[PDB]
Curated annotation (Swiss-Prot), chains A, B:
This is Manganese-dependent inorganic pyrophosphatase. One of its GO terms (molecular function) is manganese ion binding. The lineage of its organism: Bacteria, Bacillati, Bacillota, Bacilli, Bacillales. It catalyses: diphosphate + H2O = 2 phosphate + H(+). The chain holds residues 2 to 188 of 309 of the full protein. It comes from Bacillus subtilis (strain 168). Signal peptide: none annotated. It is an enzyme of class 3 (hydrolase). It is found in: Cytoplasm.
């Protein structure tokens, strides 16, 4: 019944913030999720956490000693994932990358979209579930999109990512450019 | 640009009907999609096509001679797919099975949900896009759910499937159980 949600090894802002955000969505719907991380938080992500007054996810090396099932955000390939990923069931994946080095024994909820950031997809999922995005969660989701898009300069950034960042900046109460440049400079 | 939408080799009713239904949705949304099939239509599927006045999708052996990109419904595993799947880009997958024998070079729209039929997922996609399901298309979608669920008897059947079947039967103008028994008998 408890599940862990995490992104990839060598975490980036999307991998930390999308784990926290998806755990919030799961918990606001009555489930039992803890967001965790697989490595050290970098200076860009730490700026986001500090700014929006959010705790760092707990660091884990393995999952099977804790839970039976996990959710992956921002990755799918086994070599990017937790070291004992073969010993737990992947219940869901929310991601924006190519699929490789990944198989399941059972059906699952797999949601990949060809957008520039996982948090763009989570924005969609909050709205599909009629769950309000709290100011600080919006700030973390905005941070993820700024990070993965290089402040909207990456060709991986789509109109969906820009539209999500506009929504989330309004919710978070920040100017995306001013906040984004400070966040990126902290990294 | 033209795309082909298809389900698996040895087609079943979900693989035919979900290809037709998702091509309808795509086309309503301004794309250029043709549903195709990879083998012969069985008698159960033929009943559904005849009842709802739909033509059997065109049979193909290969896709790369026609298009650059394809959408898979009701499958992902390469050995279930078209023989030259590695020569085209997989743009999207809509499915309800485990993931295996499947990789992509690029990102894509991958939507798997742990439900009993692809058409239950497509029903959500119509509603997400505010596109009306025409009577005949609802009939094919209902046929897919009855087929995959064995008239709601299969261990894979969920409450999401049962609910979608009732909705689609109302739109199609049939009684799900009465129509479904005749369709199943035809196979
Ligand atoms: Mn990442
Ligand atoms: Mn990312
Ligand atoms: Mn099938
Ligand atoms: Mn199916």
């Amino acid at each position: 019944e408890k599940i862990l949600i995490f992104g990839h090894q060598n975490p980036d802002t999307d991998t930390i913030c999308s784990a926290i955000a998806y755990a919030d969505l799961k918990n606001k719907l009555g489930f039992n999720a803890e967001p965790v991380r697989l490595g050290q938080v970098n200076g860009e992500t730490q700026y986001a956490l500090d700014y929006f007054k959010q705790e760092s996810p707990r660091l884990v090396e393995t999952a099977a000693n804790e839970v039976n099932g996990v959710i992956l955000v921002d990755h799918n390939e086994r070599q990017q994932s937790i070291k004992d990923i073969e010993e737990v069931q992947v219940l869901e994946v929310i991601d924006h990358h190519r699929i490789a080095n990944f198989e399941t024994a059972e059906p699952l909820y797999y949601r990949a979209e060809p957008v520039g950031c996982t948090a763009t997809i989570l924005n969609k999922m909050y709205k599909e579930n009629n769950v309000k995005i709290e100011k600080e969660i919006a700030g973390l989701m905005l941070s993820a999109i700024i990070s993965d898009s290089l402040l909207f300069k990456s060709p991986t950034c789509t109109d969906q990512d820009v539209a999500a960042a506009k929504e989330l900046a309004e919710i978070a109460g920040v100017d995306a450019e001013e906040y984004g440049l400070n966040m990126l400079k902290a990294g």
